[PDB]
């Protein structure tokens, strides 16, 4: 409709003005705020664990595993280096978010989850039904102007596109992926024969009627992992159950489509699930039926929830609302002043509004306390750190 187009234009103007206002207040809201406009939009982001601290230099170098989203050109699996001001003081050090590696990739990258037991191996989700387990060390630094070279591994167990990609921390390898075919397939990988061409699914899970939006492994037990789907039913699957159809737990957990999921790094029972109901709800694995506090301040879908690795009571959510909200779980229920109540719930700690488009993905840097890299569909990557005064 023409009215819809006029409203979209007005909203674009308002979004630009809001971004300008936010950037005016960026010094008073963040300690570090670095915005980089990637050549191609990225649908994924995950800091590599390795960090380099050059002696005599005021900064440090971290590695980001970014994807690519080309309209028709050759998609890539970008790996870039980011310079962070470390503890004290940089003014001008030339390139700060320059790329390091670029491996050719058939189709846009949907996920860039590296293998934790070996950050050399990085997996990727293609628009096709097959997942590719790259190895950026083996591949050439510069991209070969040809087709998608042999990724050293290509697992095909799905029937359509997928978005979930979970790496087992307790077991080396074990990349489990959930696709739109209502199937969450698990590939053993790792202990597999060399000369990687095709890797069949070790076990495929069909217990979610709708399209499984995402899936994550349990951070303590190697036999447990949660899967969340569009049927509004977050399921916690237990391996070695002699059945690949009935999950151990089948809590509905939401009303609208539930997209993301992330276990608490510290607690062995706390997990968060963001959904299309504009609600990020915490959960306890001790009792499945009962629901914990439901963080409700988003105005659109919650596409990604990720607990902070440096804190046990901090969780961040983002999605189509174009806002990145940081929640302090230990602040839930605290009495607030009327101005504080007007600003937002006591649980909510910070709202990042530097993105003019939907946040495709975000991640924390394990080597830094409170810095987050969030990539939007506007081909914008922002590495930002919340101001110290917010969290003492």
């Amino acid at each position: 409709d023409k009215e819809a187009a006029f409203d979209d234009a007005v909203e674009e103007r308002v979004i630009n003005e809001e971004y300008k206002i936010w950037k005016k207040n960026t010094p008073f809201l963040y300690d570090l705020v670095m915005t980089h406009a990637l050549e191609w939009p990225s649908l994924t982001a995950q800091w590599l664990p390795d960090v380099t601290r050059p002696e005599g230099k005021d900064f440090s170098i971290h590695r980001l595993v970014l994807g690519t989203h080309t309209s028709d050109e050759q998609n890539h699996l970008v790996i870039a280096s980011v310079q962070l001001p470390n503890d004290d003081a940089f003014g001008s050090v030339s390139g700060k978010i320059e790329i390091e590696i670029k491996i050719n990739h058939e189709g846009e990258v949907n996920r860039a989850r590296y293998m934790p037991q070996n950050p050399c191996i990085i997996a990727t989700k293609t628009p096709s039904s097959d997942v590719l387990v790259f190895d950026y060390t083996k591949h050439p630094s510069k991209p070969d102007p040809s087709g998608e070279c042999n990724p050293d591994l290509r697992l095909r167990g799905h029937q359509k596109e997928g978005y979930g990609l979970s790496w087992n921390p307790n077991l080396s390898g074990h990349l489990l992926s959930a696709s739109d075919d209502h199937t969450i397939c698990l590939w053993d990988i790792s202990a597999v024969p060399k000369e990687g061409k095709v890797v069949d699914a070790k076990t495929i899970f069909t217990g979610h009627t709708a399209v499984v939006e995402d899936v994550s492994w349990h951070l303590l037990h190697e036999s447990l992992f949660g899967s969340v789907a569009d049927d509004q039913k977050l399921m916690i699957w237990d391996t070695r159950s002699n059945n690949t159809s009935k999950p151990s737990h089948s809590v509905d957990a939401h009303t609208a489509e539930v997209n993301c999921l992330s276990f608490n790094p510290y607690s062995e029972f706390i997990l968060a699930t963001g959904s299309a109901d504009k609600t990020v709800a915490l959960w306890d694995l001790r009792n499945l039926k009962l629901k914990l506090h439901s963080f409700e301040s988003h105005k659109d879908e919650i596409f990604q929830v990720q607990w902070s690795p440096h804190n046990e009571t901090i969780l961040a959510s983002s999605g189509t609302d174009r806002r990145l909200n940081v929640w302090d779980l230990s602040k839930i229920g605290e009495e607030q002043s009327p101005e504080d109540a007007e600003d937002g719930p006591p649980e909510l700690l910070f709202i990042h509004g530097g993105h003019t488009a939907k946040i495709s993905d975000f991640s924390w840097n394990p080597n830094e306390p409170w810095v987050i890299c969030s990539v939007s569909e506007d081909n914008i990557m922002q590495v930002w750190q919340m101001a110290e005064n917010i969290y003492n």
């Binding site: 979209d8 234009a9 909203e11 103007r13 504009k278 105005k299 189509t320 174009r322 600003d343 488009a357």
Partner: protein, 109 residues
């Protein structure tokens, strides 16, 4: 001096915003009766609970109808509620551009 950066709002968006503001001030009385930060809704009795009274406020599809006694109805025939406390589910109806998903489109996830 420095060149004029060609302000992005222009006049068409300004005209639409002026129209929306005029409608908002005529409907919710935000400027006059809302003290600049609240919506002044006027309730209307619809049904009588003979066991309270059900009242519906003038800006429709914003706040649910509630049951109030006759004395309560007389006391609160008009309700002023701050924008912060508006129900998040239906608060967006106060203006088309209060929050609009810019990429409506299709495909994506």
């Amino acid at each position: 001096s420095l060149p004029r950066p060609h302000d992005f709002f222009d006049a068409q968006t300004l005209d639409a915003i002026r129209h929306r503001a005029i409608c908002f001030n005529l409907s919710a009385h935000i400027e006059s009766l809302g003290k600049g930060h609240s919506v002044v809704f006027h309730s209307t009795v619809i049904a009588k609970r003979k066991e309270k009274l059900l009242l519906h406020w003038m800006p429709e599809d914003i706040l649910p109808d509630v049951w109030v006694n006759e004395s309560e109805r007389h006391q609160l025939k008009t309700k002023v509620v701050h924008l912060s406390k508006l129900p998040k589910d239906t608060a967006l109806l106060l203006d088309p551009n209060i929050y609009r998903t810019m990429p409506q489109k299709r495909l994506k996830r």
